[PDB]
């Protein structure tokens, strides 16, 4: 929630990259459930969350 509040209200989708990174830290690797759970908290459709995970290299999908 501190990450989301860094961004302007109404564009909370911008927190996708840092929040998805947070799921990586407490899980090592992010499974599809982590990518779905990021979608619910950030209200972003899961497809857009899937785009970010596959595009950037650091996110360990395996």
């Amino acid at each position: 929630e501190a990450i989301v509040k860094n961004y302007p209200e109404g564009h909370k989708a911008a927190a996708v990259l840092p929040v998805l990174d947070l799921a990586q830290r407490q899980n090592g690797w992010l499974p599809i459930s982590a990518m779905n759970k990021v979608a619910e908290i950030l209200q972003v459709p899961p497809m857009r969350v899937y785009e970010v995970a596959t595009f950037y290299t650091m996110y360990n999908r395996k």
Partner: protein
């Protein structure tokens, strides 16, 4: 501007009696004047610039042999092209054919801006690119 024994020929051109068409194919046929729409699969527009003349379809059965699509209407594949509706609609009754005309559909101009893809307020901001 041509003195060639000019006489008053007001009555409409009625060449139908000369084209040799049988009586059946001259009244009971309803031709259609239309600008063909673009093939929705494609995006080009070079096929929607000339008015087309076509005859209403008729029976098309199957042969007792291997079974092609037989027909008995000679005016089935006849498609004519005209550069203007007035020329097209004039060729119909001059040849004596009942017609219906559909006006050309012009794609209305739509204002498109790339900056709208990333809008501060409006819901037109996209979620992917």
């Amino acid at each position: 501007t041509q003195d060639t024994q000019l006489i008053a020929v007001d009555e409409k051109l009625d060449i139908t009696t000369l084209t040799g068409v049988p009586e059946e194919h001259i009244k009971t046929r309803k031709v259609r004047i239309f600008v063909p729409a673009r093939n929705n699969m494609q995006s080009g527009v070079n096929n929607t610039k000339k008015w087309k003349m076509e005859f209403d379809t008729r029976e098309r059965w199957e042969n007792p042999l291997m079974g092609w699509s037989s027909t008995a209407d000679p005016l089935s594949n006849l498609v004519l092209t005209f550069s203007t509706k007035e020329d097209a609609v004039a060729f119909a009754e001059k040849n004596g054919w009942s017609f219906d005309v559909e006006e050309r559909k012009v794609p209305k101009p739509k204002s498109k801006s790339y900056g709208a893809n990333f809008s501060w307020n409006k819901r037109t901001r996209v979620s992917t690119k």
